Amino acid sequence: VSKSTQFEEAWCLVRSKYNDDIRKGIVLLEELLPKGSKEEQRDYVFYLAVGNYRLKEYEKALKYVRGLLQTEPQNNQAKELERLIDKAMKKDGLLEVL
Amino acid sequence: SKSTQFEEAWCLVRSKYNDDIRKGIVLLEELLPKGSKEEQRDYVFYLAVGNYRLKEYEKALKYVRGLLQTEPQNNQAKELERLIDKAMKKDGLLEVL
């Protein structure tokens, strides 16, 4: 039932090797998001970006991390994650058309 | 701006067209992190409404139940929950709204 239980569970799933676990972790984070404080929602949003990045949902991950940067332009984790997204995207495009 | 995106999402989620409702859902979900608390109230309610109308019952239920956690006496939310519960039992024509 608990909110910490869901977030701790989702933290593990988003860190997981298996894509099914990452998807479920995102599903938990999406449900937690409307229930969080403004600061928790910032954390939730960063972890939603990470999860979608690992699932190769690069456009969704980029949308989450761009939103974080609208309001926190000095956030270095978000800048770094955006850099990583850009780089995976460029390599994935190459793979598509080879 | 936030107000005009919500004004567009408000129209979309109430539209007669399924395409519109989908896009309204997209827009409310982006607004969700950006809103004050008395703003997220409306965002969460209209996400539940939109998902309900597209027969995304599990999503709609998650949204309204969270709203009922914060506002146990909210009779519009409770009514929308009653509607979701009923649509989940058998595929049919969703009630007027």
Author numbering:
A (entry chain B): 30 to 127
B (entry chain A): 31 to 127
Sentences from the paper on this structure:
A tetratricopeptide repeat (TPR) motif containing mitochondrial outer membrane protein, mitochondrial fission protein 1 (Fis1), mediates mitochondrial fission by recruiting large cytosolic GTPase, Drp1, to the mitochondrial outer membrane. The cytosolic domain of Fis1 is composed of 6 tight α-helices with two anti-parallel TPR motifs forming a concave hydrophobic surface. Fis1 interaction with Drp1 occurs during cellular stress, but not under physiological conditions, suggesting that cellular signals during stress activate Fis1. Human Fis1 protein contains a single cysteine, Cys41, in the entire protein.
To explore this possibility further, we crystallized and determined the X-ray structures of the WT and three phosphorylation mimic-mutants of Fis1: Thr34Asp Fis1, Thr34Glu Fis1 and Tyr38Glu Fis1. Each of these mutants was previously shown to be sufficient to increase Drp1 recruitment to mitochondria and subsequent mitochondrial fission in cell-based studies. Consistently, we observed that the first 30 residues including the α1 helix were missing from the structure providing strong evidence that the α1 helix undergoes significant conformational change and is potentially disordered in the phosphorylated forms, whereas it was intact in the WT. In one of the instances, Tyr38Glu Fis1 mutant was crystallized in an intermediate state, where the α1-helix was still intact, but was shifted away from the rest of the protein, as compared to the WT. We crystallized the phosphorylation-mimic mutants, Thr34Asp, Thr34Glu and Tyr38Glu Fis1, and we observed that in all the cases, these mutants crystallized as covalent dimers mediated by Cys41 disulfide bridge between two Fis1 protomers. As Thr34Asp, Thr34Glu and Tyr38Glu Fis1 have a greater propensity for a conformationally altered N-terminus and hence have more exposed Cys41, they crystallized as covalent dimers. Upon closer examination of the crystal structures, we observed that the concave hydrophobic surface in the covalent dimers of all the phosphorylation-mimic mutants was exposed. Here we showed that Cys41 is also oxidizable and mediates Fis1 covalent dimerization through disulfide linkage. This oxidation-induced Fis1 dimerization was obvious in the crystal structures of Thr34Asp, Thr34Glu and Tyr38Glu Fis1, where we saw a clear electron density for the disulfide linkage.
